[PDB]
Swiss-Prot record:
Residues carrying sugar: N47, N170
Disulphide-bridged cysteine pairs: C22-C63, C56-C101, C155-C203
Lineage, top ranks: Eukaryota, Discoba, Euglenozoa, Kinetoplastea, Metakinetoplastina
Transmembrane region(s): none
Recorded consequence of changing T186A: In clone 1800-2
Superkingdom of source: Eukaryota
UniProt-annotated catalytic positions: C25, H162, N182
Role summary: Hydrolyzes chromogenic peptides at the carboxyl Arg or Lys; requires at least one more amino acid, preferably Arg, Phe, Val or Leu, between the terminal Arg or Lys and the amino-blocking group.
Segment of the intact protein contained: 123 to 337 of 467
Note: Purified cruzipain is able to degrade itself, yielding a complex mixture of small peptides, and a major 25 kDa fragment.
Protein name: Cruzipain
UniProt-reported outcome of changing S64G: In clones 1800-2 and 1800-4
Family recorded in the similarity comment: Belongs to the peptidase C1 family.
Effect of V164F: In clone 1800-4
Amino acid sequence: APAAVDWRARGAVTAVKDQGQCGSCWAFSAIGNVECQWFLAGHPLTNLSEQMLVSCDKTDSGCSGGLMNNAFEWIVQENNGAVYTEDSYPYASGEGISPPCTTSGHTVGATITGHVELPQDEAQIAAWLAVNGPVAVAVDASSWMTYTGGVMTSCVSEQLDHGVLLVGYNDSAAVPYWIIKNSWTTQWGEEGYIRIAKGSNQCLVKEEASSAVVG
């Protein structure tokens, strides 16, 4: 695989968002992945709706958590593949309470047809990402609250609790690293991103990697 990849160089990644006090990271991870896959399929980069998932995907648990794979399945199996635009279905859960689902008044911004669940293998995830784009992953982010920069090599890796988006890596650095988009504003980390060490399953990053499929 290439020595380093960063999908931001293709303009394939939307701006860092703010999930607020809702436990909706699963939706931010899934939607961020869809946004990138939609762009890479040859469509304009479009901000898509986390709120659609938080409010309407009843296989997941709104502000009380969920799974990116469940979200991708819900989109395809219950919403005809459709993902609404953020502009037409804006986020409304930042205080920690998700409003009920609304079915009318929204605009389809992207469609997906399925999703892939990747091997639990950092090299194979990296190789897939190098060709196919950003990857939704679950991590243990319980230790991340005060991160301000650098390659995190001290990640409590006890239990998955947070969904994020792998956007790249650099295998050439002395401590190789993943590049990860978070959903805690640009005031957190490195303009809203974090680098974690790559190759030792830091933060359990290899354990639940997946991507939507567009087309």
